[PDB]
Amino acid sequence: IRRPEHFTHHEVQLSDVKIHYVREGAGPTLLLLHGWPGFWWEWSKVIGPLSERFDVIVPDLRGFGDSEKPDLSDLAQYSLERVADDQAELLNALGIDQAYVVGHDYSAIVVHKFIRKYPDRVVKAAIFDPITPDFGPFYLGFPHIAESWYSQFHQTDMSVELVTSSREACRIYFKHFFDHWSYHAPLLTQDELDIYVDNCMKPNNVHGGFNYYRSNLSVTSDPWTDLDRTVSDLPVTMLWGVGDPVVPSSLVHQVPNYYSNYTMELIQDAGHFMMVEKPEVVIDRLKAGFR
Amino acid sequence: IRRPEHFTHHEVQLSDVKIHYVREGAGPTLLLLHGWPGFWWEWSKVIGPLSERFDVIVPDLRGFGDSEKPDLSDLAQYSLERVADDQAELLNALGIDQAYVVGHDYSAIVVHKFIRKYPDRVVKAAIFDPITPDFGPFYLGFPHIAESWYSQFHQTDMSVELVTSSREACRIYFKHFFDHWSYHAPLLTQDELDIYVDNCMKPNNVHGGFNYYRSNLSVTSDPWTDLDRTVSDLPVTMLWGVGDPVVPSSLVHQVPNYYSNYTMELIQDAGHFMMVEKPEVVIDRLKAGFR
Amino acid sequence: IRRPEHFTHHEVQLSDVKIHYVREGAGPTLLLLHGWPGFWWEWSKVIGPLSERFDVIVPDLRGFGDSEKPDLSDLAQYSLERVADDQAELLNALGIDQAYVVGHDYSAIVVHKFIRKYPDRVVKAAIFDPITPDFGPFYLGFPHIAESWYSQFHQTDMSVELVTSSREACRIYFKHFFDHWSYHAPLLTQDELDIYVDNCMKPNNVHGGFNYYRSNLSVTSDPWTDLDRTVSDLPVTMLWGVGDPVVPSSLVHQVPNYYSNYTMELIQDAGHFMMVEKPEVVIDRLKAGFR
Amino acid sequence: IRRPEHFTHHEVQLSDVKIHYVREGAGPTLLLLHGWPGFWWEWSKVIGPLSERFDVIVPDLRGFGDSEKPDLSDLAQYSLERVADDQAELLNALGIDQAYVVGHDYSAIVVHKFIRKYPDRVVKAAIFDPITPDFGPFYLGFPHIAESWYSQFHQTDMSVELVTSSREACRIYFKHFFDHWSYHAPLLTQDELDIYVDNCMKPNNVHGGFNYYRSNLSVTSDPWTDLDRTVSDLPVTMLWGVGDPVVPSSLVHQVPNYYSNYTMELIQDAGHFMMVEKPEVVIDRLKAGFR
Amino acid sequence: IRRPEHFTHHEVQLSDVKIHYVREGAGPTLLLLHGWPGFWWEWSKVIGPLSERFDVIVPDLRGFGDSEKPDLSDLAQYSLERVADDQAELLNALGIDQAYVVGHDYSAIVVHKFIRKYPDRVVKAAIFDPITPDFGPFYLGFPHIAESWYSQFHQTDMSVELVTSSREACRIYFKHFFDHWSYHAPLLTQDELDIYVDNCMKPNNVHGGFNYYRSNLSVTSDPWTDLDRTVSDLPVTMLWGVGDPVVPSSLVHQVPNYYSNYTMELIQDAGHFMMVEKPEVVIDRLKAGFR
Amino acid sequence: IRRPEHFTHHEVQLSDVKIHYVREGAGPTLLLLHGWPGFWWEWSKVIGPLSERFDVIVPDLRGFGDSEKPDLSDLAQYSLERVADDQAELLNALGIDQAYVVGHDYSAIVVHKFIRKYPDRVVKAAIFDPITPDFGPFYLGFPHIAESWYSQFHQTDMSVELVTSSREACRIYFKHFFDHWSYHAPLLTQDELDIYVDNCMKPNNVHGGFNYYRSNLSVTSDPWTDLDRTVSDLPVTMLWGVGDPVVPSSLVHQVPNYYSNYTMELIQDAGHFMMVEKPEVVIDRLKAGFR
């Protein structure tokens, strides 16, 4: 295990948020983008190996980890469009013209947006369990509400009050998602889960994360733009963990309408957290895809 | 306030469960049936006044309050059809030929079932915010999942673990439903909420209640029978609290397909807990309806 | 029986029609609005009793009874929107700021329109067997044409010629509707039917009534406005006669889209003419509803 | 004009009805079948001319004219299937192996049925304004109820009472249909209309005719058989009067599904009564079609 | 047989094409319009007989026969709208105010267009196996692609290369359509087929014909105008060959939406080439229809 | 170029056909299955390289190449189900328990069928431009008939007569498909095309190939079984040539319903003939996929 403190930590002031990140390695820039309920450290198993070939950059999304939580009452500051803008600003701030970009979960949408809005800043991309503009009707539909109920729980003030009421309550809540969304539970050792809980229990982090659901996944939300509804012919490497119940491999059928130059591989013994559950697959497929 | 201990408590052994109830008054029998997340005591404001005209009987549903929790692993023992059977058995056990029956929430379904399955055991009925066989597609549909998410949360083991992890967690969770489902929050005084929490924290009561959702409201559940899909011409008094967001007054449109002899009244300053929020309305309308 | 001549008769000149009415009693103003094939006198059983608590005003609609028949060739003068305007003008002319208003049949639409167009002139309203903007497709649909055929018969010149060809033909025709639309035929004694026939046989009254069908119920008619398609939160007392075959109690399902503050009661032994068949119910429910 | 008494009148006892007919001429047998509200005499203008080339046989349908009215309470005896059977029996009784058959209105259905059920008894057929098994949804649909309302009026006892209440009422009623269904009103001279009224006023004839509507055109009627829903390749000559509003020329589109060997001609100045309004067209087209 | 050289041949310079035609007879002008894969000579059996009563004019369509092939790369010059314009120009050029016009196949569309765009230049019209604006979805639909495949073959350059590769290849190809589209194959004698092949093998004639398919029957083509979607009340004589598999007699159902003054006759032993397979029927029906 | 004669040729007698094949190499068995309009030799560029790691077996499908043409009048002998059975028999006859199987075009269906019907005879599979049971409605739908027209041309006797009329006609026809279905035309050198034409011109080979279309792709054909409509969890390597217009890369969306364990890669500069246009990709991806 490589604990958070065994990386080098940076912060950079962007136009309306401070972004925290770790950075390591040499070569072309590889930008790794996390999801919920993790943060930058979910990539910790692959950063080292990948840094042998890349300048690996791993930020906390705004509202996550040690990155700034914008005005918690202003949901416009938690829109995914701005999170994609943050990545362009991050590259500008670091003097980087082009990067390889990788995302999943919320960052699957960030990458979707990014490669279309900033096409000249991408070399190639990778997405794990990709999410397209046609996700919405499936995800909040029947019977998938059996899996997506939590997106609506997060709309309530009570969810924040309950989940942050104690470290014990927090651990209980988040453990369910790590385990249920994985191919083989437990996903995490006790020490690893403690580190995720440490992060969730930082001031405003549970609230910050739930604001993503309020801004982008309320029943009146629409996080997608016209530009998002275009075909991209950028080379994209896609993986799916067939054990993912919340963004299931059936959703491959939504991909061809948005991409003309991709690969897809269904990983048989992985769920929603590919970089945690099958880190060697991630390292191998990215090194191969981005050769 | 009339605390639980200021009533007379009974238990009776039915064919496969022990049912706890309180009983008070003289006259025709009036059977009052509670919902989730309450228990018999939610009727405590109206029992006394109604007992001036009726033999008021108020049981805990199986799986609730001080009634027996059947085998927690056997969801068939938490089907609403059996809960309706329990009411027929209760009347048999007490030597009662016919009763006036009143329900809401889960007991709206119990009464729906009861008056059709045991039509000769009913004088007249009343339902608050009634639920019909056509409820399902609306309730788990879009956008109502913003309100019904909790029915799916309850499918998880983690929900029980979290909500029972401490009295504080329990209070936080249940308070949301009392307040959000009411017309004007707070619904309850601190002492009143403590009493509901005391009950929820009794061994197996949170689990017992969540089993109702697992048996009757999973995405593969079907609690309705062919007999339920028949028109009843029994006199039924119906009330709706227009402040009810989870079973909203729009659902009046589903009632005419199932009833030919009813009244309906929309109460302007009540939500989901009519007997708690507007007890004088309940007393008046039942005394009038059942004259 | 209280014959027409045993009331006090008035006429008032409104902006484009003379309206005939009877008036009786003291208290808040209660405006009672008749339908087809009756006239003001259909209310004759309840006027006296209601006048003990209200200033009861009962007009003939334009085109009916002793009220003026506008230009029989001008269907715009028989639109229901103008009939609703007539009621506002009547109140103005009598120096009345606000009234309780009651309607059924055609006057169900008049009241629908009135309470939305002149909301400041209503205290509370009542409608019997209410008709909403969604009536049309049901009423002229299949199989309801078995009941609504007469609305299309009335489009023909031959219908007027036939029905007015003799007092005997007139009696034969109208008796069918009084009896078939009631819960228990005969609706009327011989003397009562003679009085309705006397009125129908007045010059232009059959034609006047049929013009309502030509203006508002032809296959190219549209009597509803945008304003009519709004929700009203005025207190409205609604009754349905379950024996009504032409505006059946199934149509309760159309009401919730237009009203948020109402009561509904299905009367088991009444049809389309509640004030004729169950006058004591009408008196009781209006006195109660408008207390 | 050739009055009824200027023909030779016959009656024949068939298996369950007595059928009246007139007969004239020599050659192949030509069977002419009338509709509502006429009887055999509507063919009176063409019988003479056609008898120069054919053995013309013109019956009253059961329930019409001077033919027997079966048990007026037994609607099964007014089904169109039996009326088609009557034509086969008529031919048998007269020792006729094959005939040319012509129908319209109700007899359009009779001929439809006849040529499929008794195909070996037909040489060729002709239908004016033909009616197929797909008629129903159009005819009782919206907006055609503006034209078909009378089929539902006839379901009522009051319709018989009203229309037979006097010769004057009878004349008024039937004149509407002769005139409105024709291309150019008036269809008839005064003397001609008097003859139709004489026939309608014969005992039970209005009732008999209305029973056709009750048996075959109620909202729960189904006069068509499986055999009727087959394609016929018999030679069929079809005419349409474009002035026919009740069976309009748009209904040509329903014909190709049922016929593979036909002609169609739209007559520009005729309505529903081709043999009355354009007798020379009828004579010419039948002589030509049946050469 | 009347060979091409036994007619009198003309050419006239119209505004953007030279049109070749033959002309014969005296009387009102009768304009006969051919289809694919023929040319003017397909009418050769009926021209003589018809010339006894008419001034018969029979042109090659632009792109066919000896008429000019416009710029083969410019599909706008092969639109059917311009082919209809050519007929108006032809009449102008010959000093003819009005003509009887007859078409089938592609010329069914030409006549459809012509009688609506130049209504004052038509006396009466005739169409064989008529084609309306609603043809498209049927013709390129399933299962009719089993018959319409050739319209898509013609989109390819290879079709021209193959079909013109030799006289033998040409004969093989076109013979299929003459025979398969007829009621009884063979349609043609050997000498007659040789004459059609002679014409197809003229420079650019196969290409010219295939351009009709490219301009008017590609999957992105739309040859119809708003004016084409109007009802015509011009007298139109229509025939159908029931043996036509490519424009089948079922399509009669599309005709009533576009015509209010027509006749239709299904010819039992004819297919797609009525003037070739049943010339005496054509002569008789046109002489009769245009009397 | 490696000409046909530079391979070793075999024939084996199976239960109802003689199958011709070439075979080369050592290792696990790799069975390569061709499509239309090729034969075994389309694999000629990859056989040698692949034989370094595999026992490569490459048969002509029944009805193709030098394999037997069953009774040309018996379409049941050209059903794809029997072609899949032939592969099981081939393996049995050669004493092979399991093979890697690769297909495209018609053999995409053969492999689909094979891996489900004979699951114990497959190690892993690969499909190029895969075809599933949901292909039909797309392929013969609109607008894809612009591409699929040839499947219906092949239903006609004339297609065989035309295409085999000379070597020149044959070359012209087949060249279109090699070129139009490829990413960059020309697909073939002149010598390579001559070899394909040599094969097509062998007795009955054009007819044999067209029989595949008659048996499996007529508008009344159904080549799929219930077993075909099942999910396979065999490892399958899939490639798509994005330049393929007849089986386009959009059809990836049909794959997830039938496979749970696959990879997909869109090749940017290949069309329908991956093994011909991008042989090094085929060699690399199969060696990698089947390691």
Task: Dump the DSSP string for B136-179.
Answer: HHHHTSTTTHHHHHHHHHTTSHHHHHHHTS-HHHHHHHHHHHHH
Helix axis angle, D106-117 to D205-216, nearest 10°: 60
Q: Is residue D263 part of a domain?
A: yes
Q: Can you give the three-state secondary structure of chain C, one letter per residue?
A: CCCHHHCCEEEEECCCCEEEEEEECCCCEEEEECCCCCCHHHHHHHHHHHHCCCEEEEECCCCCCCCCCCCCCCHHHHCHHHHHHHHHHHHHHCCCCCEEEEEECHHHHHHHHHHHHCHHHEEEEEEECCCCCCHHHHHCCCCCHHHHHHHHHCCCHHHHHHHCCCHHHHHHHHHHHHHHCCCCCCCCCHHHHHHHHHHHCCCCHHHHHHHHHHHHCCCCCCCCCCHHHCCECCCEEEEEECCCCCCCHHHHHHCCCCECCEEEEEECCCCCCHHHHCHHHHHHHHHHHCC
Q: Helix (H, G, I), strand (E, B), or coil: what is residue A146?
A: helix
Alpha-carbon distance of B104 to B106, in angstroms, equals 6
Nearest Cα to Cα of residue D93 among D33, D27, D8, D15: D15
Reduced to 3 states (helix: H, G, I; strand: E, B; else coil), residue A54 is coil
Kindly determine whether residue B165 and residue A161, on different chains, have CB atoms separated by under 8 Å.
no
Tracing tokens 């692949």 back to the chain, one arrives at F50
- Neighbours of B, requiring at least 3 CB pairs below 8 Å, are A, C
How far A62 CA lies from chain B's nearest CA (Å)?
25
Retrieve residue B20's tokens.
């706890």
**Tokens at residue B274, please?**
């009519």
Chains D and A touch (3+ CB pairs under 8 A): no
Per DSSP, helices labelled H in D181-237 are 190-200, 205-216
Residue C250 touches partner B, C-beta closer than 8 Å: yes
Residue C141 lies in a domain: no
Per DSSP bridges, beta strands A29-33 and A99-104 are parallel
Rounded Cα distance between D200 and E178, Å, is: 60
Give the chain F residue nearest A264 (alpha carbons).
F264
Residue of E nearest to D261 (CA): E266
Distance CA C126, CA C291 (A): 13
Locate tokens 């896609």: which residue? A238
Cα torsion E102, E107, E108, E114: sign: negative
Token pair in block for residue E288: 């009769």
Report the distance separating Cα E107 and Cα E32, nearest Å.
Answer: 9
Q: Is F242 close to A263, i.e. CB distance below 8 A?
A: no
Whether residue C156 is contained in a domain is answered as: no
Q: Which residue of D has its CA nearest to E234?
A: D268
Distance from CA of D153 to the nearest CA of C (A): 6
Compute the distance between CA of residue F126 and CA of residue A41 in angstroms, rounded to an integer.
Answer: 38
- What's the token pair of residue F118? 């004979």
C79-to-C11, C74, C84, C215, D77 alpha-carbon distances in Å: 21, 10, 9, 6, 46
- Selection from D235, D228, D218, D219 nearest residue D288 by Cα: D235
Sign of CA dihedral F3, F8, F13, F15: negative
Token digits of residue F194: 């001559």
Note whether F231 contacts E: Cβ–Cβ < 8 A: no
Nearest to B14 by CA among B99, B85, B115, B109: B85
Rounded (5°) CA angle B215-B220-B225: 70
Distance CA C41, CA C56 (A): 13
- Determine if the peptide bond prior to D119 is cis (ω within 30°): no
Q: Which approach determined this entry? A: X-ray
Collapse the DSSP code of A24 into the 3-class scheme (helix H, G, I; strand E, B; otherwise coil) and give the result: strand
Asked whether the beta carbons of residue F166 and residue E168 sit closer than 8 angstroms, the reply is yes
CB of D269 within 8 Å of a chain E CB? The answer is no
D240 in any annotated domain: yes
Q: Where are the alpha helices (DSSP H) in chain A?
A: 44-50, 80-93, 106-117, 135-139, 145-153, 157-163, 167-180, 190-200, 205-216, 274-277, 279-289
Put simply, whether E166 touches F (Cβ < 8 Å) is: yes
Retrieve residue C22's tokens. Answer: 């009877």
Running DSSP on this structure, what letter comes out for residue F156? S
Query: CA D24: distance to chain centroid?
Result: 19
Tell if the CB–CB gap between A266 and F265 is shorter than 8 Å: no
Exposure pattern of D200-230 as b/e (b: 16+ CB <10 Å)? Answer: bbeeebbbbbbbbbbbbbbeebebbeeebee
Nearest to D151 by CA among D67, D210, D235: D210
d(CA E268, CA E240): 9
Is the Cβ pair F252, A249 closer than 8 Å? no
- Chain D residues touching E264 at Cβ < 8 A: 263-265
Q: Which of A213, A258, A259, A262 is catalytic?
A: A213
Q: Is A263 on the interface with F (CB under 8 A)?
A: yes
Shortest CA distance from F177: residue in chain E: E158
Residue F156: closest C-alpha in chain E: E176
Partner B contacted by A149 (CB < 8 A): yes
Q: Give the whole-angstrom CA distance, residue B255 versus residue B231.
A: 10
- Token pair, residue A150, equals 């939590």
Contact between C265 and C239 (Cβ < 8 Å): yes
Q: Coil, strand, or helix at residue B191? A: helix
Q: Coil, strand, or helix at residue B96? A: coil
Distance of CA C114 to the CA centre of its chain: 13
> What is the distance between the alpha carbons of residues B96 and B109, in angstroms, rounded to a whole number?
22
Q: Measuring CA to CA, which residue among D271, D236, D252 is closest to residue E258?
A: D252
φ, ψ at B53 (rounded to 5°) = -125, -15
Q: Which position among E66, E86, E105, E228 bears the catalytic label?
A: E105
Cβ within 8 Å of residue F116, ≥6 positions away: F227, F228, F230, F232
Nearest to F16 by CA among F72, F77, F74: F77
Q: How far apart are CA D16 and CA D77, in angstroms?
A: 9
Provide the CB-side half-sphere exposure for B153 (13 A, CA): 22
Torsion sign (Cα): E104, E110, E112, E118 = negative
Q: Which chain C residues are within 8 Å of B256, Cβ to Cβ?
A: 249-250, 252-253
Buried residues in E237-262 as b, exposed as e (16+ CB within 10 A)? bbbbbbbbebbbbebbbbbbebbbbb
Q: What is the DSSP letter of D34?
A: -
Q: Do E145 and F152 touch (CB under 8 A)?
A: yes
The answer for residues whose C-beta is within 8 angstroms of residue D222's C-beta and 6 or more apart is none
Q: Using CA atoms, how far apart are residues C7 and B19, in angstroms rounded to an integer? A: 64
Tokens coding A225:
């733009």
What would the two tokens of residue B128 be? 């608050």
Asked if D170 and D163 count as a contact pair (C-beta separation under 8 A), the reply is yes
Which residue in chain C is spatially nearest to B265 when comparing CA positions? C263
Tokens for C257, please give them.
């889209």
Specify the amino acid at residue E67: S
| Contact predicate D115/D122, CB 8 Å | yes
Longest CA span, chain D: 48
* Residue from the list C256, C261, C265 with its beta carbon closest to the beta carbon of B250: C256
Instruction: Classify F267 as helix, strand or coil.
Output: strand
Q: Does A234 touch chain F (CB under 8 A)?
A: no
**Secondary structure of C63-116 in HEC code, one letter for each residue:** CCCCCCCCCCCCHHHHCHHHHHHHHHHHHHHCCCCCEEEEEECHHHHHHHHHHH
Q: What's the CATH number where E120 sits?
A: 3.40.50.1820
Phi, psi of A280 (to 5 degrees): -65, -35
Helices (H), chain F: 44-50, 80-93, 106-117, 135-139, 145-153, 157-163, 167-180, 190-200, 205-216, 274-277, 279-289
Q: What torsion do the CA atoms of D110, D116, D117, D121 make, to the nearest 10 degrees?
A: 90
What is the CB-side half-sphere exposure of residue D235 using CA atoms within 13 A? 12
DSSP at F35: -
Give the integer Cα–Cα distance in Å for E186 and F114.
45
Buried b (16+ CB within 10 A) or exposed e, C58-88: bbbbbbbbbbbbbeeeebebbbbbbbbbbbe
CA-closest candidate to residue D188, choices D84, D44, D51? D44
Give the separation between CA E34 and CA E108, rounded to whole angstroms: 9
A136-to-A141, A247, F189, F250 alpha-carbon distances in Å: 8, 11, 50, 21
Question: Out of C142, C146, C169, whose CB is closest to D141?
Answer: C142
Answer yes or no: B272 catalytic. yes
Hey, what are F115's tokens?
Answer: 């891996």
Active site residue E6: no
- Answer yes or no: are the C-beta atoms of C215 and C79 closer than 8 Å: yes
37-56 of E, contacting D, C-beta below 8 A: none
Residue E205 carries which side chain, given as an amino acid letter?
N
Which 8-state DSSP code applies to residue E1?
-
Please indicate if any CB of chain B lies within 8 Å of the CB of C253.
yes
Name the pairing type of β-strands B99-104 and B122-128: parallel
Record the tokens describing residue B25, joined without a space.
């008054």
Q: Which two tokens stand for residue D24?
A: 């004239």
What chain A residue is nearest to F237 in terms of C-alpha separation?
Answer: A265
Q: Which two tokens stand for residue E251?
A: 């399509």
Residues of E in contact with F158 (CB under 8 A): 172-173, 175-176
Structure tokens at E221: 């083509």
Active site residue B106: no
**With an 8 Å Cβ cutoff, is A183 touching chain F?**
no
Q: For residues F132 and F175, is the Cβ–Cβ distance under 8 A?
A: no
- Residue D64 DSSP symbol: S
A33 strand-pairing partners? A103
Beta bridge partners of E20: E11
Taking CA atoms, C270 is separated from C45, C131, C193, E149, E238, in Å, by 15, 17, 18, 67, 61
Q: Do the Cβ atoms of D152 and C145 come within 8 Å?
A: yes
What residues form DSSP beta bridges with B112?
none
Neighbours of A288 (CB within 10 A): 11
CA distance B15 to B86: 8
**Residues of chain B contacting C132 with CB distance shorter than 8 Å:** none
Residue B139, chain A, CB below 8 Å: the answer is: no
Total of domains in chain C: 1
* CA E261/CA E272 separation, integer angstroms: 23
Pairing of strands B55-59, B18-24: antiparallel
Determine which one of E100, E106, E213, E258 is catalytic.
Answer: E213
Which of A152, A154, A210 is the best substitution to test chain B (most B C-beta atoms within 10 A)?
Answer: A152
What does DSSP assign to residue A11? E
CB-CB contact of B53 with B287 (8 Å): yes
Collapse the DSSP code of F233 into the 3-class scheme (helix H, G, I; strand E, B; otherwise coil) and give the result.
coil
Within 10 A of D28 (CB to CB), how many other CB atoms are there?
15
For the CA atoms of chain B, what is the radius of gyration? 17
Q: What is the residue range of F76's domain?
A: 4-289
Whole-angstrom distance, CA of residue E49 vs CA of residue F154: 41
Tokens of A49: 């190996």
